[PDB]
């Protein structure tokens, strides 16, 4: 009855204030490489941490000392923590993520617009808007009437909508010509074939 | 570090005055769910996800209890050093290309939030619009500050002006981030 | 009344046999760099030649000596020859070629076929046939359901039909799957947008 | 050498026994035209080209006269060394994907031709087919040998077999290059 697991926050011994506990797990090349980092933050200051590549608790600042000492003293805490790497990170990735986030596919929607706003003394910017896609993996190319435009391509940073979708703006530098067709070519894992869009007139 | 994916699996937050606490999970920078510490229900960002997997709320509550305890201990160990109010940064942008008359969503990304206490609201033609409005949880930042997203559904129109009201303690006066279909430089 | 010019063959002094006179002109970066090479061949042996970068006739073999000596003796021949570079090569390129060969565009025709002949123990080869195009400039890419296939692409040499058109075969290595769409993407100067074709089932 | 384009502008060929001579122009490996030293007419490969530019046949004939003269002189200077017959290589291939019943053209590329004297012919189901047949001039090769292209229009059919008969002096017996719509290994 319980699929997705959460990393447990260790309790210590003995105006506006805040504390944050962060359990983070990084994966690379599947589940082949899994590292577990947990942090204890007071206000905005991390004081104690548990790093996979380290093997135990370490204070990152002077006030994290009492906890590093104690929790490393307590074999249980140390063992619960040290093992979360399989029970939580490997577990979640295998189970949850692989049937949830790792399978999410959002097909991008491309549109082309004439930019840098007016008509031709320096007016070149074709903006292609690729929006509402997932994951963040993507390749956009520009084509000027048959061939690809390498020089004069400017991509804006990847924007994260927050609703599990991205968007980005890829521009092409120019000075148009009648008889010319500019194409926006997008390559993404959600598509079955790269998608296209074209501007003229 | 170098990673192909990163899951935030146990993230807890607790603030003393008011006994304010939060519990969430993220995967690759996106919010998975949060636990209604009031209803005691695991609420999913993508409701299709909780349909295929499930999180037991007691796991979160248990973590809230840990941080609540630790909060007390750390406060004293610090000699009662309080949090320092930072000034948030907001940016308004549309989910898709704004096309006059075509249904869309306005997005307000507020960053550098600390402490994790804030008021994000929307105004159309200068009056509050409580209208298909949604708001993310406090999403975690690497520098231990938070960021948040607010949404407003709307159908593009040149005759309306939108503001995202952001109020914070690190805030002197409400910040009003503008947006208009006609490019409306401040109103 | 006379547009295209031909390079003139210099006459010398004083069983099956053959001789060939070859006037060749190479151009690079337009008409900015033009080199004129003329050869005199006996059977299959080149004996005398005139090279731009050289300035005069040179024997390439021992029997080309009498002609190199003489033609370099005759100021006319030497001057007629040396000047052909502008009168024939620059001329032809500017005039003729630029309105004829340099403007020829033949749009390619792509087709996809299942290859290496049978059904699936090692059966992968998707052959894309891009035929009847001009000029020889071209770029072909393979896409497996949204993303580009870099590994497993094999292009046959460019074939010259002889009718002022080319063709080539670009293959993709594989072991199919249901739900997969493979696309043949062709980029060419005759097209207005890269052209596509797709294989499934 | 390194070049973006190369034009062959004055190419002449002369053979003594028979007073056989030829004159052509090429651009980037393709044949531009040849001069009918008989009709005295500049014949274009792409007839659309001669419509926009023109070559005066006397230019070619003048070059034929030069090589005819030079031929005599060189022959004696060589002590009458004759040409050496080489063995040509032929390859048959379709201009486009063979599709049963769809009009197409078969192409026969014959290489390593020297001397520039040869007989290229077509056979269908083993009988000569003089049928929309075309043949290029002797196209020049870098090693001073020549190559040639012959064409045969046809509508693909499994029930016919095609051969390209190539006869040369460096040829012992006619070479027959096979081609069939069903993959007909030799017949």
mmCIF file of N, CA and C in Angstrom, chain D residues 15-128:
data_model
loop_
_atom_site.group_PDB
_atom_site.id
_atom_site.type_symbol
_atom_site.label_atom_id
_atom_site.label_comp_id
_atom_site.label_asym_id
_atom_site.label_seq_id
_atom_site.Cartn_x
_atom_site.Cartn_y
_atom_site.Cartn_z
ATOM 1 N N UNK D 15 42.583 10.651 -83.565
ATOM 2 C CA UNK D 15 43.137 9.322 -83.757
ATOM 3 C C UNK D 15 43.456 9.224 -85.232
ATOM 4 N N UNK D 16 44.657 8.745 -85.533
ATOM 5 C CA UNK D 16 45.138 8.673 -86.912
ATOM 6 C C UNK D 16 44.473 7.708 -87.872
ATOM 7 N N UNK D 17 44.551 6.400 -87.594
ATOM 8 C CA UNK D 17 43.884 5.535 -88.571
ATOM 9 C C UNK D 17 42.393 5.842 -88.569
ATOM 10 N N UNK D 18 41.911 6.404 -89.674
ATOM 11 C CA UNK D 18 40.502 6.747 -89.788
ATOM 12 C C UNK D 18 40.211 8.232 -89.637
ATOM 13 N N UNK D 19 41.222 9.002 -89.242
ATOM 14 C CA UNK D 19 41.077 10.443 -89.072
ATOM 15 C C UNK D 19 39.895 10.738 -88.165
ATOM 16 N N UNK D 20 39.879 10.033 -87.043
ATOM 17 C CA UNK D 20 38.854 10.164 -86.024
ATOM 18 C C UNK D 20 39.130 11.245 -84.985
ATOM 19 N N UNK D 21 38.271 12.254 -84.931
ATOM 20 C CA UNK D 21 38.480 13.323 -83.976
ATOM 21 C C UNK D 21 37.215 13.756 -83.264
ATOM 22 N N UNK D 22 37.372 14.290 -82.059
ATOM 23 C CA UNK D 22 36.226 14.729 -81.287
ATOM 24 C C UNK D 22 36.526 16.014 -80.533
ATOM 25 N N UNK D 23 35.485 16.811 -80.296
ATOM 26 C CA UNK D 23 35.622 18.092 -79.590
ATOM 27 C C UNK D 23 34.445 18.342 -78.648
ATOM 28 N N UNK D 24 34.746 18.566 -77.371
ATOM 29 C CA UNK D 24 33.712 18.813 -76.369
ATOM 30 C C UNK D 24 34.097 19.833 -75.295
ATOM 31 N N UNK D 25 33.135 20.087 -74.418
ATOM 32 C CA UNK D 25 33.296 21.005 -73.303
ATOM 33 C C UNK D 25 32.561 20.355 -72.132
ATOM 34 N N UNK D 26 33.113 20.480 -70.932
ATOM 35 C CA UNK D 26 32.477 19.931 -69.740
ATOM 36 C C UNK D 26 32.520 20.959 -68.623
ATOM 37 N N UNK D 27 31.638 20.802 -67.649
ATOM 38 C CA UNK D 27 31.675 21.680 -66.495
ATOM 39 C C UNK D 27 31.364 20.878 -65.240
ATOM 40 N N UNK D 28 32.380 20.718 -64.401
ATOM 41 C CA UNK D 28 32.252 19.980 -63.155
ATOM 42 C C UNK D 28 31.957 18.492 -63.386
ATOM 43 N N UNK D 29 32.613 17.921 -64.393
ATOM 44 C CA UNK D 29 32.455 16.509 -64.703
ATOM 45 C C UNK D 29 31.310 16.129 -65.624
ATOM 46 N N UNK D 30 30.496 17.108 -65.996
ATOM 47 C CA UNK D 30 29.349 16.856 -66.859
ATOM 48 C C UNK D 30 29.587 17.427 -68.257
ATOM 49 N N UNK D 31 29.107 16.726 -69.286
ATOM 50 C CA UNK D 31 29.281 17.161 -70.680
ATOM 51 C C UNK D 31 28.360 18.311 -71.107
ATOM 52 N N UNK D 32 28.961 19.416 -71.542
ATOM 53 C CA UNK D 32 28.215 20.602 -71.976
ATOM 54 C C UNK D 32 27.634 20.476 -73.387
ATOM 55 N N UNK D 33 28.482 20.080 -74.323
ATOM 56 C CA UNK D 33 28.086 19.905 -75.713
ATOM 57 C C UNK D 33 29.227 19.178 -76.444
ATOM 58 N N UNK D 34 29.022 18.927 -77.733
ATOM 59 C CA UNK D 34 30.066 18.387 -78.614
ATOM 60 C C UNK D 34 29.788 18.970 -79.987
ATOM 61 N N UNK D 35 30.806 19.045 -80.830
ATOM 62 C CA UNK D 35 30.621 19.611 -82.161
ATOM 63 C C UNK D 35 30.560 18.567 -83.263
ATOM 64 N N UNK D 36 29.453 18.547 -84.000
ATOM 65 C CA UNK D 36 29.290 17.631 -85.123
ATOM 66 C C UNK D 36 30.292 18.111 -86.158
ATOM 67 N N UNK D 37 31.445 17.463 -86.221
ATOM 68 C CA UNK D 37 32.489 17.868 -87.156
ATOM 69 C C UNK D 37 32.070 17.561 -88.583
ATOM 70 N N UNK D 38 30.888 16.967 -88.690
ATOM 71 C CA UNK D 38 30.312 16.595 -89.963
ATOM 72 C C UNK D 38 29.253 17.609 -90.386
ATOM 73 N N UNK D 39 28.313 17.884 -89.490
ATOM 74 C CA UNK D 39 27.271 18.854 -89.785
ATOM 75 C C UNK D 39 27.834 20.239 -89.486
ATOM 76 N N UNK D 40 28.840 20.269 -88.620
ATOM 77 C CA UNK D 40 29.486 21.508 -88.209
ATOM 78 C C UNK D 40 28.518 22.288 -87.323
ATOM 79 N N UNK D 41 27.896 21.574 -86.387
ATOM 80 C CA UNK D 41 26.930 22.165 -85.476
ATOM 81 C C UNK D 41 27.224 21.867 -84.019
ATOM 82 N N UNK D 42 27.141 22.898 -83.191
ATOM 83 C CA UNK D 42 27.381 22.743 -81.769
ATOM 84 C C UNK D 42 26.133 22.138 -81.147
ATOM 85 N N UNK D 43 26.241 20.879 -80.714
ATOM 86 C CA UNK D 43 25.129 20.145 -80.100
ATOM 87 C C UNK D 43 25.208 20.085 -78.564
ATOM 88 N N UNK D 44 24.209 20.652 -77.901
ATOM 89 C CA UNK D 44 24.164 20.716 -76.446
ATOM 90 C C UNK D 44 23.550 19.508 -75.747
ATOM 91 N N UNK D 45 24.152 19.122 -74.624
ATOM 92 C CA UNK D 45 23.675 17.991 -73.836
ATOM 93 C C UNK D 45 22.343 18.424 -73.233
ATOM 94 N N UNK D 46 22.337 19.613 -72.639
ATOM 95 C CA UNK D 46 21.134 20.203 -72.050
ATOM 96 C C UNK D 46 20.785 21.278 -73.083
ATOM 97 N N UNK D 47 19.820 20.992 -73.959
ATOM 98 C CA UNK D 47 19.425 21.919 -75.029
ATOM 99 C C UNK D 47 18.923 23.263 -74.540
ATOM 100 N N UNK D 48 18.658 23.352 -73.251
ATOM 101 C CA UNK D 48 18.183 24.602 -72.707
ATOM 102 C C UNK D 48 19.369 25.557 -72.612
ATOM 103 N N UNK D 49 20.576 24.992 -72.521
ATOM 104 C CA UNK D 49 21.819 25.767 -72.410
ATOM 105 C C UNK D 49 22.241 26.525 -73.668
ATOM 106 N N UNK D 50 22.136 25.867 -74.821
ATOM 107 C CA UNK D 50 22.532 26.495 -76.071
ATOM 108 C C UNK D 50 21.584 27.612 -76.441
ATOM 109 N N UNK D 51 20.469 27.660 -75.725
ATOM 110 C CA UNK D 51 19.449 28.661 -75.949
ATOM 111 C C UNK D 51 19.849 29.978 -75.306
ATOM 112 N N UNK D 52 20.718 29.885 -74.307
ATOM 113 C CA UNK D 52 21.169 31.052 -73.573
ATOM 114 C C UNK D 52 22.619 31.425 -73.843
ATOM 115 N N UNK D 53 23.351 30.540 -74.504
ATOM 116 C CA UNK D 53 24.745 30.807 -74.817
ATOM 117 C C UNK D 53 25.083 30.066 -76.089
ATOM 118 N N UNK D 54 26.190 30.425 -76.721
ATOM 119 C CA UNK D 54 26.538 29.734 -77.941
ATOM 120 C C UNK D 54 28.010 29.587 -78.227
ATOM 121 N N UNK D 55 28.331 28.456 -78.839
ATOM 122 C CA UNK D 55 29.694 28.151 -79.198
ATOM 123 C C UNK D 55 29.811 28.049 -80.707
ATOM 124 N N UNK D 56 30.835 28.714 -81.233
ATOM 125 C CA UNK D 56 31.108 28.734 -82.656
ATOM 126 C C UNK D 56 31.953 27.522 -83.038
ATOM 127 N N UNK D 57 31.345 26.578 -83.765
ATOM 128 C CA UNK D 57 31.976 25.333 -84.222
ATOM 129 C C UNK D 57 33.376 25.438 -84.815
ATOM 130 N N UNK D 58 33.676 26.557 -85.470
ATOM 131 C CA UNK D 58 34.987 26.739 -86.080
ATOM 132 C C UNK D 58 36.053 26.678 -84.994
ATOM 133 N N UNK D 59 35.665 27.039 -83.776
ATOM 134 C CA UNK D 59 36.600 26.991 -82.674
ATOM 135 C C UNK D 59 37.045 25.557 -82.454
ATOM 136 N N UNK D 60 36.092 24.634 -82.546
ATOM 137 C CA UNK D 60 36.394 23.224 -82.373
ATOM 138 C C UNK D 60 37.182 22.711 -83.563
ATOM 139 N N UNK D 61 36.623 22.853 -84.759
ATOM 140 C CA UNK D 61 37.308 22.411 -85.967
ATOM 141 C C UNK D 61 38.759 22.901 -85.993
ATOM 142 N N UNK D 62 38.969 24.145 -85.568
ATOM 143 C CA UNK D 62 40.309 24.714 -85.551
ATOM 144 C C UNK D 62 41.218 23.896 -84.627
ATOM 145 N N UNK D 63 40.639 23.421 -83.529
ATOM 146 C CA UNK D 63 41.358 22.628 -82.545
ATOM 147 C C UNK D 63 41.562 21.214 -83.056
ATOM 148 N N UNK D 64 40.661 20.753 -83.917
ATOM 149 C CA UNK D 64 40.794 19.405 -84.470
ATOM 150 C C UNK D 64 41.984 19.418 -85.409
ATOM 151 N N UNK D 65 42.082 20.497 -86.179
ATOM 152 C CA UNK D 65 43.160 20.670 -87.142
ATOM 153 C C UNK D 65 44.526 20.706 -86.455
ATOM 154 N N UNK D 66 44.563 21.304 -85.267
ATOM 155 C CA UNK D 66 45.783 21.421 -84.477
ATOM 156 C C UNK D 66 46.253 20.045 -84.028
ATOM 157 N N UNK D 67 45.339 19.274 -83.448
ATOM 158 C CA UNK D 67 45.660 17.936 -82.964
ATOM 159 C C UNK D 67 45.969 16.948 -84.084
ATOM 160 N N UNK D 68 45.366 17.160 -85.250
ATOM 161 C CA UNK D 68 45.599 16.295 -86.404
ATOM 162 C C UNK D 68 47.050 16.467 -86.847
ATOM 163 N N UNK D 69 47.493 17.724 -86.854
ATOM 164 C CA UNK D 69 48.848 18.106 -87.237
ATOM 165 C C UNK D 69 49.791 17.545 -86.190
ATOM 166 N N UNK D 70 49.571 17.939 -84.939
ATOM 167 C CA UNK D 70 50.373 17.458 -83.820
ATOM 168 C C UNK D 70 50.455 15.937 -83.759
ATOM 169 N N UNK D 71 49.371 15.267 -84.135
ATOM 170 C CA UNK D 71 49.359 13.814 -84.112
ATOM 171 C C UNK D 71 50.490 13.325 -84.983
ATOM 172 N N UNK D 72 50.489 13.750 -86.245
ATOM 173 C CA UNK D 72 51.532 13.345 -87.170
ATOM 174 C C UNK D 72 52.927 13.564 -86.608
ATOM 175 N N UNK D 73 53.189 14.774 -86.107
ATOM 176 C CA UNK D 73 54.501 15.113 -85.548
ATOM 177 C C UNK D 73 54.905 14.254 -84.356
ATOM 178 N N UNK D 74 54.000 14.104 -83.397
ATOM 179 C CA UNK D 74 54.282 13.306 -82.215
ATOM 180 C C UNK D 74 54.539 11.840 -82.545
ATOM 181 N N UNK D 75 53.753 11.273 -83.454
ATOM 182 C CA UNK D 75 53.918 9.866 -83.838
ATOM 183 C C UNK D 75 55.357 9.569 -84.230
ATOM 184 N N UNK D 76 55.905 10.423 -85.086
ATOM 185 C CA UNK D 76 57.274 10.275 -85.557
ATOM 186 C C UNK D 76 58.278 10.506 -84.431
ATOM 187 N N UNK D 77 58.001 11.484 -83.579
ATOM 188 C CA UNK D 77 58.888 11.803 -82.470
ATOM 189 C C UNK D 77 58.965 10.654 -81.483
ATOM 190 N N UNK D 78 57.911 9.846 -81.441
ATOM 191 C CA UNK D 78 57.834 8.711 -80.533
ATOM 192 C C UNK D 78 58.506 7.474 -81.105
ATOM 193 N N UNK D 79 58.723 7.508 -82.416
ATOM 194 C CA UNK D 79 59.291 6.407 -83.188
ATOM 195 C C UNK D 79 58.119 5.465 -83.391
ATOM 196 N N UNK D 80 56.979 6.084 -83.651
ATOM 197 C CA UNK D 80 55.747 5.378 -83.926
ATOM 198 C C UNK D 80 55.233 4.430 -82.859
ATOM 199 N N UNK D 81 55.289 4.871 -81.606
ATOM 200 C CA UNK D 81 54.786 4.078 -80.493
ATOM 201 C C UNK D 81 53.261 4.122 -80.589
ATOM 202 N N UNK D 82 52.606 2.950 -80.660
ATOM 203 C CA UNK D 82 51.149 2.913 -80.759
ATOM 204 C C UNK D 82 50.453 2.910 -79.403
ATOM 205 N N UNK D 83 49.136 3.072 -79.431
ATOM 206 C CA UNK D 83 48.332 3.103 -78.220
ATOM 207 C C UNK D 83 48.213 1.705 -77.632
ATOM 208 N N UNK D 84 48.026 1.609 -76.321
ATOM 209 C CA UNK D 84 47.868 0.298 -75.700
ATOM 210 C C UNK D 84 46.411 0.084 -75.275
ATOM 211 N N UNK D 85 45.787 -0.946 -75.838
ATOM 212 C CA UNK D 85 44.405 -1.276 -75.528
ATOM 213 C C UNK D 85 44.236 -1.645 -74.065
ATOM 214 N N UNK D 86 43.250 -1.032 -73.436
ATOM 215 C CA UNK D 86 42.960 -1.298 -72.044
ATOM 216 C C UNK D 86 41.639 -2.048 -72.034
ATOM 217 N N UNK D 87 41.317 -2.665 -70.904
ATOM 218 C CA UNK D 87 40.072 -3.406 -70.794
ATOM 219 C C UNK D 87 39.064 -2.528 -70.064
ATOM 220 N N UNK D 88 37.954 -2.192 -70.733
ATOM 221 C CA UNK D 88 36.924 -1.347 -70.114
ATOM 222 C C UNK D 88 36.169 -2.044 -68.987
ATOM 223 N N UNK D 89 35.472 -1.263 -68.169
ATOM 224 C CA UNK D 89 34.673 -1.810 -67.079
ATOM 225 C C UNK D 89 33.281 -1.221 -67.254
ATOM 226 N N UNK D 90 32.257 -2.067 -67.215
ATOM 227 C CA UNK D 90 30.889 -1.595 -67.369
ATOM 228 C C UNK D 90 30.073 -1.893 -66.125
ATOM 229 N N UNK D 91 29.065 -1.057 -65.884
ATOM 230 C CA UNK D 91 28.173 -1.173 -64.733
ATOM 231 C C UNK D 91 26.800 -0.667 -65.157
ATOM 232 N N UNK D 92 25.756 -1.466 -64.945
ATOM 233 C CA UNK D 92 24.398 -1.066 -65.315
ATOM 234 C C UNK D 92 23.604 -0.686 -64.069
ATOM 235 N N UNK D 93 22.878 0.422 -64.148
ATOM 236 C CA UNK D 93 22.083 0.888 -63.021
ATOM 237 C C UNK D 93 20.938 1.775 -63.484
ATOM 238 N N UNK D 94 19.819 1.776 -62.737
ATOM 239 C CA UNK D 94 18.637 2.583 -63.055
ATOM 240 C C UNK D 94 18.716 4.007 -62.506
ATOM 241 N N UNK D 95 18.225 4.959 -63.292
ATOM 242 C CA UNK D 95 18.251 6.362 -62.904
ATOM 243 C C UNK D 95 17.455 6.594 -61.628
ATOM 244 N N UNK D 96 16.374 5.843 -61.472
ATOM 245 C CA UNK D 96 15.520 5.973 -60.299
ATOM 246 C C UNK D 96 15.112 4.603 -59.774
ATOM 247 N N UNK D 97 14.478 4.562 -58.594
ATOM 248 C CA UNK D 97 14.041 3.285 -58.025
ATOM 249 C C UNK D 97 13.161 2.534 -59.010
ATOM 250 N N UNK D 98 13.562 1.311 -59.343
ATOM 251 C CA UNK D 98 12.801 0.487 -60.266
ATOM 252 C C UNK D 98 11.471 0.116 -59.614
ATOM 253 N N UNK D 99 10.384 0.472 -60.275
ATOM 254 C CA UNK D 99 9.072 0.159 -59.768
ATOM 255 C C UNK D 99 8.347 -0.494 -60.925
ATOM 256 N N UNK D 100 7.889 -1.724 -60.714
ATOM 257 C CA UNK D 100 7.199 -2.481 -61.751
ATOM 258 C C UNK D 100 6.152 -1.672 -62.489
ATOM 259 N N UNK D 101 6.304 -1.572 -63.809
ATOM 260 C CA UNK D 101 5.387 -0.761 -64.588
ATOM 261 C C UNK D 101 5.574 0.745 -64.654
ATOM 262 N N UNK D 102 6.505 1.304 -63.890
ATOM 263 C CA UNK D 102 6.717 2.748 -63.938
ATOM 264 C C UNK D 102 7.899 3.062 -64.853
ATOM 265 N N UNK D 103 7.686 3.905 -65.877
ATOM 266 C CA UNK D 103 8.714 4.309 -66.849
ATOM 267 C C UNK D 103 10.015 4.692 -66.190
ATOM 268 N N UNK D 104 11.113 4.154 -66.694
ATOM 269 C CA UNK D 104 12.418 4.433 -66.101
ATOM 270 C C UNK D 104 13.491 4.453 -67.177
ATOM 271 N N UNK D 105 14.728 4.729 -66.775
ATOM 272 C CA UNK D 105 15.881 4.589 -67.682
ATOM 273 C C UNK D 105 17.043 3.768 -67.144
ATOM 274 N N UNK D 106 17.507 2.814 -67.938
ATOM 275 C CA UNK D 106 18.640 1.994 -67.536
ATOM 276 C C UNK D 106 19.901 2.726 -67.967
ATOM 277 N N UNK D 107 20.922 2.704 -67.117
ATOM 278 C CA UNK D 107 22.170 3.362 -67.477
ATOM 279 C C UNK D 107 23.376 2.419 -67.459
ATOM 280 N N UNK D 108 24.195 2.510 -68.506
ATOM 281 C CA UNK D 108 25.390 1.690 -68.604
ATOM 282 C C UNK D 108 26.633 2.567 -68.639
ATOM 283 N N UNK D 109 27.346 2.578 -67.520
ATOM 284 C CA UNK D 109 28.577 3.338 -67.362
ATOM 285 C C UNK D 109 29.757 2.430 -67.696
ATOM 286 N N UNK D 110 30.489 2.774 -68.750
ATOM 287 C CA UNK D 110 31.656 2.001 -69.162
ATOM 288 C C UNK D 110 32.897 2.868 -68.899
ATOM 289 N N UNK D 111 33.847 2.336 -68.131
ATOM 290 C CA UNK D 111 35.068 3.063 -67.775
ATOM 291 C C UNK D 111 36.352 2.439 -68.330
ATOM 292 N N UNK D 112 37.473 3.116 -68.094
ATOM 293 C CA UNK D 112 38.794 2.676 -68.535
ATOM 294 C C UNK D 112 38.850 2.397 -70.032
ATOM 295 N N UNK D 113 38.242 3.286 -70.809
ATOM 296 C CA UNK D 113 38.211 3.141 -72.254
ATOM 297 C C UNK D 113 39.397 3.792 -72.957
ATOM 298 N N UNK D 114 40.192 2.963 -73.625
ATOM 299 C CA UNK D 114 41.335 3.421 -74.405
ATOM 300 C C UNK D 114 41.843 2.289 -75.300
ATOM 301 N N UNK D 115 42.004 2.555 -76.602
ATOM 302 C CA UNK D 115 41.723 3.862 -77.212
ATOM 303 C C UNK D 115 40.259 4.277 -77.224
ATOM 304 N N UNK D 116 40.000 5.569 -77.440
ATOM 305 C CA UNK D 116 38.612 6.042 -77.466
ATOM 306 C C UNK D 116 37.808 5.528 -78.667
ATOM 307 N N UNK D 117 37.650 4.204 -78.752
ATOM 308 C CA UNK D 117 36.875 3.558 -79.816
ATOM 309 C C UNK D 117 36.135 2.415 -79.139
ATOM 310 N N UNK D 118 34.810 2.409 -79.250
ATOM 311 C CA UNK D 118 34.018 1.380 -78.587
ATOM 312 C C UNK D 118 32.604 1.257 -79.150
ATOM 313 N N UNK D 119 31.965 0.134 -78.824
ATOM 314 C CA UNK D 119 30.613 -0.201 -79.264
ATOM 315 C C UNK D 119 29.722 -0.530 -78.066
ATOM 316 N N UNK D 120 28.832 0.383 -77.695
ATOM 317 C CA UNK D 120 27.937 0.117 -76.574
ATOM 318 C C UNK D 120 26.525 -0.116 -77.101
ATOM 319 N N UNK D 121 25.978 -1.294 -76.818
ATOM 320 C CA UNK D 121 24.647 -1.662 -77.285
ATOM 321 C C UNK D 121 23.797 -2.373 -76.221
ATOM 322 N N UNK D 122 22.486 -2.383 -76.427
ATOM 323 C CA UNK D 122 21.548 -2.984 -75.481
ATOM 324 C C UNK D 122 20.783 -4.190 -76.015
ATOM 325 N N UNK D 123 20.545 -5.172 -75.146
ATOM 326 C CA UNK D 123 19.793 -6.367 -75.523
ATOM 327 C C UNK D 123 18.718 -6.650 -74.477
ATOM 328 N N UNK D 124 17.496 -6.900 -74.933
ATOM 329 C CA UNK D 124 16.398 -7.223 -74.034
ATOM 330 C C UNK D 124 16.036 -8.652 -74.354
ATOM 331 N N UNK D 125 15.910 -9.488 -73.332
ATOM 332 C CA UNK D 125 15.579 -10.884 -73.561
ATOM 333 C C UNK D 125 16.421 -11.419 -74.720
ATOM 334 N N UNK D 126 17.687 -11.008 -74.733
ATOM 335 C CA UNK D 126 18.677 -11.431 -75.719
ATOM 336 C C UNK D 126 18.566 -10.981 -77.181
ATOM 337 N N UNK D 127 17.858 -9.892 -77.446
ATOM 338 C CA UNK D 127 17.766 -9.384 -78.810
ATOM 339 C C UNK D 127 17.965 -7.872 -78.760
ATOM 340 N N UNK D 128 18.669 -7.327 -79.746
ATOM 341 C CA UNK D 128 18.952 -5.893 -79.773
ATOM 342 C C UNK D 128 17.728 -5.020 -79.674
#
